[PDB]
Amino acid sequence: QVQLQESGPGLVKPSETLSVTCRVSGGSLDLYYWSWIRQPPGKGLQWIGFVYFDGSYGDYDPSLRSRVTISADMSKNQISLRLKSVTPADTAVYYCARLGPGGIFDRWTGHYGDKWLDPWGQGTLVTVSSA
Amino acid sequence: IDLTQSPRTLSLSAGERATLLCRASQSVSNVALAWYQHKPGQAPRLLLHEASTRATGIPDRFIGSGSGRDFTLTITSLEPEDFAVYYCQLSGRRLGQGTKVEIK
Ligand SMILES: *[C@@H]1O[C@H](CO)[C@@H](O[C@@H]2O[C@H](CO)[C@@H](O[C@@H]3O[C@H](CO[C@H]4O[C@H](CO[C@H]5O[C@H](CO)[C@@H](O)[C@H](O)[C@@H]5O[C@H]5O[C@H](CO)[C@@H](O)[C@H](O)[C@@H]5O)[C@@H](O)[C@H](O[C@H]5O[C@H](CO)[C@@H](O)[C@H](O)[C@@H]5O)[C@@H]4O)[C@@H](O)[C@H](O[C@H]4O[C@H](CO)[C@@H](O)[C@H](O[C@H]5O[C@H](CO)[C@@H](O)[C@H](O)[C@@H]5O)[C@@H]4O)[C@@H]3O)[C@H](O)[C@H]2NC(C)=O)[C@H](O)[C@H]1NC(C)=O
Ligand SMILES: *[C@@H]1O[C@H](CO)[C@@H](O[C@@H]2O[C@H](CO)[C@@H](O[C@@H]3O[C@H](CO[C@H]4O[C@H](CO[C@H]5O[C@H](CO)[C@@H](O)[C@H](O)[C@@H]5O)[C@@H](O)[C@H](O[C@H]5O[C@H](CO)[C@@H](O)[C@H](O)[C@@H]5O)[C@@H]4O)[C@@H](O)[C@H](O[C@H]4O[C@H](CO)[C@@H](O)[C@H](O)[C@@H]4O)[C@@H]3O)[C@H](O)[C@H]2NC(C)=O)[C@H](O)[C@H]1NC(C)=O
Ligand SMILES: *[C@@H]1O[C@H](CO)[C@@H](O[C@@H]2O[C@H](CO)[C@@H](O)[C@H](O)[C@H]2NC(C)=O)[C@H](O)[C@H]1NC(C)=O
């Protein structure tokens, strides 16, 4: 029932800021996490990070930590990903999916529902070149 | 933590059985495991969560098991439509190696 779709640019020169946008059109962002997954063209799938819909929790890849920023707007039904220091190694395919069943609400209780990862969407391709 | 998949590839025929191996560096409970079906040019999808609970809409030939640190996905009767890379990753997804199953 829940249908989501990624979006973004296609040609990013280096020393810029990458910015992609995932939009949901089947329900709300409520009671779930929201994640990002990278696939380089030679290798397999890589994890970037995920965020909670309140904006009160986020878990990141230790490799890509200090250059990434994930945000979500409850009303506009969208999630934006931003990335700094664009290299030609960042030419890859980007995926957007919602995480497991948990609605574990708080900073005090501790965010504890994370099991599976349902719909993934089509994805997008980001090519880094100077042409 | 670290995760490792073996074998790296497989090419078999229909009506046969496949067997994969997914191994963690430490002891992992039976809940944070999921199995995937990534076809090229398509959208990947969930096959199995919590290492035994079958996802909705995928056929019964995909059966998984394992415990502690040894995990296994098994197709009972191979089909020509099962040409996809299969992924096992944890809850936080910070690993992943990949295994491609081909049709002979
Ligand atoms: C029973 O239990 C339930 C369960 O809790 C209760 O349900 C909640 O009820 C709340 C009361 O109504 C309800 O309110 C909302 O709460 C939102 C959450 O705010 C929290 O998080 C904020 C963000 O924290 C991150 O960022 C900080 C700084 O950046 C950082 O310090 C933090 O550590 C944290 O970082 C984490 O995330 C990072 C990124 O993922 C990650 O990198 C990092 O490692 C960390 O993991 C935080 O700011 C906030 O703390 C204070 O914020 C201000 C300070 O001024 C103050 O108002 C707060 O009260 C608090 O003191 C808190 O911790 C909150 O964001 C919602 O805000 C909305 O409304 C306000 C006011 O109208 C508005 O400002 C916001 O709009 C802005 O943002 C929008 C986009 O989001 C824009 O579109 C707007 O234009 C505007 O810019 C929001 O609309 C809101 O207050 C909440 O929904 C319920 N919780 C959940 C999870 O559902 C229930 O109430 C209980 N009681 C009863 C009786 O039932
Ligand atoms: C609104 O109400 C809801 C409803 O109650 C409420 O939601 C609950 O919130 C509490 C938070 O206080 C949750 O309780 C936590 O549960 C954690 C469970 O993690 C362990 O268990 C997983 C398997 O389930 C268990 O099944 C049974 C039941 O206990 C048991 O027989 C099994 O042995 C098994 O334990 C397992 O997957 C999990 O693995 C974790 O860690 C791996 C590490 O890689 C990670 O990848 C996994 O994704 C997972 O995170 C783990 O084994 C539990 O950890 C936690 O425990 C705290 O205390 C212990 C000490 O006792 C500490 O060691 C630990 O660090 C924690 O601090 C805690 O008990 C509960 O699960 C929610 N309920 C549901 C249904 O989700 C909301 O909070 C309420 N909201 C408000 C605002 O009030
Ligand atoms: C809890 O309430 C929120 C609204 O505060 C629900 O979100 C709405 O869900 C309906 C049904 O899918 C959508 O048509 C609306 O667009 C949603 N609102 C927003 C702002 O996105 C949420 O679904 C409720 N939680 C449930 C039912 O579990």
Contacts of B34 in chain A (CB under 8 A): 115-117
Closest CA to B93 of A92, A49, A112: A49
- Asked if the bond preceding A88 is cis, omega within 30° of 0, the reply is no
Continuous H helices in chain A:
none
Q: Return residues 51-70 of B near A (CB < 8 Å).
A: 55
**Which residue segment(s) compose the domain that A68 sits in?**
1-131
Closest CA to A28 of A76, A99, A80: A76
What residue ranges do the domains of chain B occupy? Answer: 1-104
* Residues in CB range of B14: below 8 A, 6 or more apart: B77, B78, B79, B80, B103
DSSP symbol at A65: G
- How would you write chain B as a 3-class SS string? CCEEEECCEEEECCCCCEECEEEECCCCCCCCCEEEEECCCCCCEEEEECCCEECCCCCCCEEEEEECCEEEEEECCCCCCCCCEEEEECCCCCCCCCEEEEEC
Ligand nearest to the CA of A29: 3
Torsion angle of the four alpha carbons B36, B41, B43, B47, in this order, in degrees rounded to the nearest 10: -20
Ligand nearest to the CA of B30: 2
Contacts of A100 in chain B (CB under 8 A): 49, 91
Contacts of B85 in chain A (CB under 8 A): 44
User: φ, ψ for residue A105 (rounded to 5)?
Assistant: -80, 110
Residue in chain A closest to B97 (alpha carbons) equals A44
Q: Are A48 and A36 in contact (CB under 8 A)?
A: yes
Cα A63 to Cα A29: distance, rounded to the nearest angstrom: 27
Q: Are B89 and B34 in contact (CB under 8 A)?
A: yes
Q: How many CA atoms lie within 13 Å of B1's alpha carbon, on the beta-carbon side?
A: 17
* Residues in CB range of A43: below 8 A, 6 or more apart: none
Cα A61 to Cα A51: distance, rounded to the nearest angstrom: 12
Q: Ligand 1 mean position to A53 CA, how many Å?
A: 10
Would you call A126 helix, strand, or coil by DSSP?
strand
Cα B20 to Cα B8: distance, rounded to the nearest angstrom: 9
* Count of domains for chain A: 1
Strands B70-75 and B18-19: antiparallel
Burial grade of A129 (CB within 10 A; 0-12, 13-18, 19 or more): exposed
Cα B14 to Cα B19: distance, rounded to the nearest angstrom: 14
* Residues in CB range of B42: below 8 A, 6 or more apart: none
Cα A18 to Cα A81: distance, rounded to the nearest angstrom: 8
Experiment used for this model? cryo-EM
Choice from A23, A28, A74 to test ligand 3 binding pocket (greatest atom count within 8 A of CB): A28
Would you call A64 helix, strand, or coil by DSSP?
coil
Sole residue written with tokens 């309140």: A54
Q: Ligand 1 mean position to A101 CA, how many Å?
A: 21
Q: Are A98 and A53 in contact (CB under 8 A)?
A: no
